[PDB]
Tab-separated table of C-alpha atoms and ligand atoms in Angstrom:
chain	number	residue	atom	x	y	z
A	1	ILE	CA	29.364	-12.926	0.850
A	2	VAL	CA	31.107	-16.297	1.063
A	3	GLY	CA	30.330	-18.917	-1.520
A	4	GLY	CA	28.136	-16.675	-3.713
A	5	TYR	CA	28.347	-15.326	-7.245
A	6	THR	CA	28.829	-12.021	-9.061
A	7	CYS	CA	25.344	-10.434	-9.177
A	8	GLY	CA	25.835	-8.457	-12.383
A	9	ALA	CA	26.026	-4.677	-12.523
A	10	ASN	CA	22.889	-2.920	-11.214
A	11	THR	CA	20.886	-6.196	-11.075
A	12	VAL	CA	20.111	-5.507	-7.421
A	13	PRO	CA	18.904	-1.904	-7.851
A	14	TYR	CA	17.877	-1.375	-4.202
A	15	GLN	CA	21.344	-2.285	-2.877
A	16	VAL	CA	23.223	0.653	-1.429
A	17	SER	CA	26.750	1.094	-0.083
A	18	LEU	CA	27.251	3.165	3.059
A	19	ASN	CA	30.491	5.165	2.686
A	20	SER	CA	32.471	7.104	5.338
A	21	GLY	CA	35.615	7.407	3.204
A	22	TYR	CA	35.305	3.722	2.324
A	23	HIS	CA	32.522	1.171	2.094
A	24	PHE	CA	31.580	-0.068	5.554
A	25	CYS	CA	28.057	-1.496	5.394
A	26	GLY	CA	25.181	-2.245	3.042
A	27	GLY	CA	21.611	-0.859	3.032
A	28	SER	CA	18.368	-1.070	1.079
A	29	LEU	CA	16.574	1.784	-0.681
A	30	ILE	CA	12.893	1.708	0.402
A	31	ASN	CA	11.769	4.936	-1.246
A	32	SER	CA	13.324	7.900	-2.978
A	33	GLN	CA	14.516	9.473	0.320
A	34	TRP	CA	15.008	6.582	2.777
A	35	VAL	CA	17.421	3.692	3.319
A	36	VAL	CA	17.124	0.830	5.806
A	37	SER	CA	20.266	-0.640	7.293
A	38	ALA	CA	21.475	-2.297	10.495
A	39	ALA	CA	21.712	-0.244	13.683
A	40	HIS	CA	25.172	-1.694	14.316
A	41	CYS	CA	26.219	0.138	11.114
A	42	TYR	CA	25.456	3.549	12.745
A	43	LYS	CA	28.046	6.291	12.514
A	44	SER	CA	28.122	9.964	11.582
A	45	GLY	CA	29.336	11.302	8.235
A	46	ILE	CA	27.480	8.746	6.083
A	47	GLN	CA	27.304	9.156	2.316
A	48	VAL	CA	24.830	6.800	0.678
A	49	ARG	CA	26.021	5.388	-2.636
A	50	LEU	CA	23.301	4.167	-4.965
A	51	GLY	CA	23.644	2.539	-8.385
A	52	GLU	CA	26.969	0.925	-7.502
A	53	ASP	CA	28.617	-2.169	-8.914
A	54	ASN	CA	32.385	-1.661	-8.625
A	55	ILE	CA	32.685	0.456	-5.467
A	56	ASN	CA	36.179	1.552	-6.482
A	57	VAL	CA	35.459	2.711	-10.053
A	58	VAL	CA	33.007	5.371	-11.309
A	59	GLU	CA	31.072	3.371	-13.938
A	60	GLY	CA	28.267	5.823	-14.709
A	61	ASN	CA	25.064	4.836	-12.810
A	62	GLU	CA	26.089	6.112	-9.376
A	63	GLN	CA	24.220	8.578	-7.212
A	64	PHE	CA	26.067	9.790	-4.129
A	65	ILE	CA	23.809	11.496	-1.536
A	66	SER	CA	24.654	12.547	2.005
A	67	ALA	CA	22.507	11.467	4.906
A	68	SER	CA	20.534	14.302	6.510
A	69	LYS	CA	19.336	12.220	9.468
A	70	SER	CA	19.890	8.773	10.981
A	71	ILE	CA	17.381	6.999	13.288
A	72	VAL	CA	18.473	3.946	15.211
A	73	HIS	CA	15.562	1.814	16.390
A	74	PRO	CA	14.361	3.038	19.819
A	75	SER	CA	14.996	-0.360	21.391
A	76	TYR	CA	18.290	-1.294	19.714
A	77	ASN	CA	20.570	-3.217	22.108
A	78	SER	CA	24.122	-3.364	20.835
A	79	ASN	CA	25.075	-6.163	23.250
A	80	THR	CA	22.395	-8.663	22.076
A	81	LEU	CA	21.783	-7.078	18.656
A	82	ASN	CA	18.046	-7.175	19.326
A	83	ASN	CA	16.302	-4.611	17.054
A	84	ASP	CA	19.339	-4.270	14.741
A	85	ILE	CA	17.730	-1.784	12.388
A	86	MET	CA	18.127	1.862	11.464
A	87	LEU	CA	16.683	4.342	8.990
A	88	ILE	CA	18.663	6.890	7.002
A	89	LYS	CA	17.083	9.862	5.317
A	90	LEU	CA	18.838	11.272	2.250
A	91	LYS	CA	19.486	15.019	1.875
A	92	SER	CA	17.856	14.859	-1.531
A	93	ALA	CA	15.602	12.355	-3.300
A	94	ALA	CA	17.270	9.719	-5.434
A	95	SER	CA	16.343	9.522	-9.108
A	96	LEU	CA	14.482	6.242	-9.685
A	97	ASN	CA	14.959	4.251	-12.933
A	98	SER	CA	15.725	0.543	-13.691
A	99	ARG	CA	19.215	0.557	-12.137
A	100	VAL	CA	18.200	2.485	-8.985
A	101	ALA	CA	14.974	1.373	-7.456
A	102	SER	CA	13.225	0.949	-4.131
A	103	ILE	CA	12.394	-2.492	-2.707
A	104	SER	CA	8.914	-3.270	-1.358
A	105	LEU	CA	8.438	-3.746	2.379
A	106	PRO	CA	6.681	-6.979	3.460
A	107	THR	CA	2.948	-6.992	4.239
A	108	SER	CA	3.457	-10.512	5.616
A	109	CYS	CA	6.438	-12.265	7.223
A	110	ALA	CA	8.364	-14.978	5.429
A	111	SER	CA	8.442	-18.620	6.440
A	112	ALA	CA	11.160	-21.270	6.647
A	113	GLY	CA	12.015	-22.759	3.256
A	114	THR	CA	11.438	-19.601	1.202
A	115	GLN	CA	14.458	-18.856	-1.082
A	116	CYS	CA	15.904	-15.347	-0.710
A	117	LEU	CA	18.612	-13.207	-2.316
A	118	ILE	CA	21.312	-11.807	-0.038
A	119	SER	CA	23.832	-9.373	-1.447
A	120	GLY	CA	26.801	-7.180	-0.518
A	121	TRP	CA	30.475	-6.178	-0.797
A	122	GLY	CA	31.540	-8.102	2.316
A	123	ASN	CA	34.384	-10.597	2.820
A	124	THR	CA	34.333	-13.552	0.402
A	125	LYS	CA	36.541	-15.880	2.522
A	126	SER	CA	35.591	-17.861	5.660
A	127	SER	CA	39.226	-18.400	6.618
A	128	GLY	CA	41.196	-15.256	5.862
A	129	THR	CA	40.201	-12.077	4.051
A	130	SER	CA	39.349	-10.876	0.524
A	131	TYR	CA	37.028	-7.964	-0.147
A	132	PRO	CA	35.447	-7.722	-3.627
A	133	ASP	CA	35.048	-4.583	-5.690
A	134	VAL	CA	31.821	-5.762	-7.415
A	135	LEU	CA	28.524	-6.764	-5.796
A	136	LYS	CA	28.219	-10.425	-4.726
A	137	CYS	CA	24.996	-12.397	-4.388
A	138	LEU	CA	23.786	-15.552	-2.621
A	139	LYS	CA	20.522	-17.423	-2.876
A	140	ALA	CA	19.655	-18.941	0.477
A	141	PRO	CA	16.635	-20.309	2.315
A	142	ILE	CA	15.123	-19.191	5.529
A	143	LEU	CA	15.710	-21.739	8.287
A	144	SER	CA	13.213	-22.887	10.901
A	145	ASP	CA	12.987	-21.032	14.189
A	146	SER	CA	13.924	-24.240	15.977
A	147	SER	CA	17.119	-24.896	13.956
A	148	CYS	CA	17.990	-21.209	14.414
A	149	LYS	CA	17.648	-21.469	18.196
A	150	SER	CA	19.509	-24.817	18.238
A	151	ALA	CA	22.433	-23.237	16.387
A	152	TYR	CA	22.490	-20.239	18.750
A	153	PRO	CA	21.087	-21.210	22.182
A	154	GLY	CA	19.700	-18.324	24.225
A	155	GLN	CA	20.505	-15.699	21.540
A	156	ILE	CA	17.672	-15.667	18.990
A	157	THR	CA	14.832	-13.210	19.679
A	158	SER	CA	11.489	-12.861	17.925
A	159	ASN	CA	13.145	-10.048	15.938
A	160	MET	CA	15.725	-12.381	14.343
A	161	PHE	CA	15.690	-15.230	11.862
A	162	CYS	CA	18.331	-17.541	10.422
A	163	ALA	CA	18.994	-18.061	6.745
A	164	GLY	CA	21.584	-20.039	4.893
A	165	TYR	CA	23.089	-23.524	5.065
A	166	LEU	CA	23.951	-25.540	8.156
A	167	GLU	CA	26.609	-27.501	6.206
A	168	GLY	CA	28.772	-24.388	5.871
A	169	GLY	CA	30.418	-22.679	2.938
A	170	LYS	CA	27.692	-20.175	1.905
A	171	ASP	CA	26.826	-17.136	4.040
A	172	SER	CA	26.998	-13.379	4.379
A	173	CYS	CA	30.009	-11.921	6.253
A	174	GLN	CA	31.725	-8.786	7.595
A	175	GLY	CA	31.050	-5.879	5.267
A	176	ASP	CA	27.634	-7.238	4.142
A	177	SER	CA	26.045	-5.991	7.404
A	178	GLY	CA	23.019	-3.737	6.949
A	179	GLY	CA	22.331	-5.148	3.459
A	180	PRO	CA	19.260	-6.884	2.056
A	181	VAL	CA	17.578	-10.228	2.282
A	182	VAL	CA	14.845	-10.180	-0.384
A	183	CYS	CA	12.281	-12.976	-0.727
A	184	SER	CA	9.709	-12.981	-3.519
A	185	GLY	CA	10.440	-9.318	-4.144
A	186	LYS	CA	10.046	-8.171	-0.512
A	187	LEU	CA	12.672	-6.956	1.959
A	188	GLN	CA	12.408	-9.643	4.665
A	189	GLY	CA	15.773	-9.321	6.383
A	190	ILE	CA	18.812	-7.227	7.191
A	191	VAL	CA	22.296	-8.745	7.456
A	192	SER	CA	22.956	-8.638	11.206
A	193	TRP	CA	25.304	-11.195	12.822
A	194	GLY	CA	26.660	-14.793	12.982
A	195	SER	CA	29.580	-16.657	14.509
A	196	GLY	CA	32.347	-16.252	11.955
A	197	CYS	CA	31.211	-16.657	8.340
A	198	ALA	CA	30.005	-19.813	6.500
A	199	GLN	CA	30.915	-22.053	9.433
A	200	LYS	CA	29.189	-25.378	9.891
A	201	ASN	CA	26.099	-25.103	12.161
A	202	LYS	CA	26.525	-21.297	12.423
A	203	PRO	CA	24.134	-19.823	9.876
A	204	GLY	CA	23.539	-16.140	9.181
A	205	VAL	CA	21.286	-14.187	11.577
A	206	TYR	CA	19.052	-11.482	10.087
A	207	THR	CA	16.870	-8.711	11.444
A	208	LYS	CA	13.185	-9.708	10.907
A	209	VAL	CA	11.941	-6.721	8.867
A	210	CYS	CA	8.239	-7.648	8.926
A	211	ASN	CA	8.187	-6.806	12.667
A	212	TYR	CA	9.283	-3.249	11.890
A	213	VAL	CA	7.043	-2.099	9.048
A	214	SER	CA	4.709	-0.101	11.333
A	215	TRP	CA	7.697	1.703	12.863
A	216	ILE	CA	9.251	2.310	9.440
A	217	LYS	CA	6.053	3.781	7.961
A	218	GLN	CA	5.256	6.045	10.897
A	219	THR	CA	8.850	7.253	11.084
A	220	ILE	CA	8.853	8.154	7.378
A	221	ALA	CA	5.469	9.839	7.813
A	222	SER	CA	6.817	12.228	10.462
A	223	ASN	CA	10.408	12.955	9.324
B	1	CA	CA1	31.177	2.616	-8.833
């Protein structure tokens, strides 16, 4: 996250870190046994890390649980990033309390102008590189479909939305991918892509979660 703030330990209790020896992507806990992340975060050997603040220090609220199964969206296209969503089942159920909690799925999509909270352990610089140990946060609005498509001609599908600031300086970034965009207590987006980070006229592009709730529920129901 570029231009954000330190969330506070365990203030974002649905935020997970995906670990393959190191943090590589974010995710969101949507029930005791399932995580949603980006399909471009897929790899084998994932350990899900719940209850994290400092990803490099054991602070006492962690749960580390191996993935038993990963499911990339049937129609994921890694060239266009259309349908950039995946589900991860945990080998055992997480213990849910105030510091580790699931986030509600939307019953309704979000509109332009709604404020949202975006979080992760991604790069904090837009020129150059600095990866934080503790979770970083950004409050950002959803942008209109038209300003999204104007920023990124021929690249925005009905499964994508823009959020952030066209002026630059405040965005998600590398390492935040797969993590949450939560608006009025609902998981509305997944950190997906963008040209650079926090660049003028190049806002963040997010997977539109409300399009996927049917798929998510039926997948959980049968796995
Ligand atoms: Ca830790």
